[PDB]
């Protein structure tokens, strides 16, 4: 499911910067970003 | 954004069509795009462009392709008709004998 | 396109698509009707012997 468990406290991987930074319009909600 | 460049200046029959599913592969996130960027990539492939990155793109794709070009071959059954007409001549040899 | 969040999803859904699928294979006998062309050629060797 590509969905990881990772039961303990305080776990993680350090390649989660892949993502870049920017920025948009004010938005209510994922639903209504979407929508 | 050079899509968008080359979009609206281009003809309403196929270009825009193609461009436009060149678009529908672009996107960004959320189930609705990601299921658009599907049958996006889905017709693509099967029109001979995607050349595909195959992670599944074989079995919902390059099967399915491979299944409608076994539609496209029952013909020879249609090349069977003509000699139908080919041998009825051989009938009329019947009628020679 | 879908892939469906599967609740009632097959029983609403992927059944009647299954059903119309059903529906889309008849075709043997369609596939039949050129082998009746094809064996008034038999007939044709009726006529042979």
Same mark, same amino acid.
């Given at each position: 499911?590509?969905?990881?468990?990772?039961?303990?406290?305080?776990?993680?991987?350090?390649?989660?910067?892949?993502?870049?930074?920017?920025?948009?319009?004010?938005?209510?909600?994922?639903?209504?970003?979407?929508? | 954004?050079?899509? @968008?460049?080359? $979009?609206?200046?281009?003809?309403?029959?196929?270009?825009? #069509?193609? @461009?436009?599913? @060149?678009? #529908?592969?672009?996107? $960004?996130?959320?189930?609705? %795009?990601?299921?658009?960027?599907? #049958?996006?990539?889905?017709?693509?492939?099967?029109?001979? %462009?995607?050349?595909?990155?195959?992670?599944?793109?074989?079995?919902? $794709? /390059?099967?399915?392709?491979?299944?409608?070009?076994?539609?496209?071959?029952? +013909?020879? /059954?249609? +090349?069977?008709? /003509?000699?139908?007409?080919?041998? +009825?001549?051989?009938?009329? +040899?019947?009628?020679?004998?």
């Amino acid at each position: 499911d590509l969905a990881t468990g990772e039961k303990q406290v305080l776990n993680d991987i350090r390649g989660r910067y892949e993502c870049y930074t920017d920025v948009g319009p004010s938005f209510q909600s994922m639903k209504q970003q979407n929508r | 954004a050079e899509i @968008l460049e080359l $979009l609206g200046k281009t003809p309403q029959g196929t270009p825009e #069509y193609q @461009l436009l599913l @060149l678009q #529908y592969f672009t996107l $960004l996130d959320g189930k609705g %795009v990601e299921m658009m960027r599907d #049958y996006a990539n889905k017709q693509l492939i099967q029109m001979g %462009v995607k050349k595909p990155e195959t992670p599944e793109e074989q079995q919902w $794709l /390059v099967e399915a392709q491979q299944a409608k070009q076994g539609q496209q071959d029952p +013909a020879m /059954v249609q +090349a069977q008709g /003509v000699l139908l007409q080919g041998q +009825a001549e051989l009938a009329k +040899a019947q009628n020679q004998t």
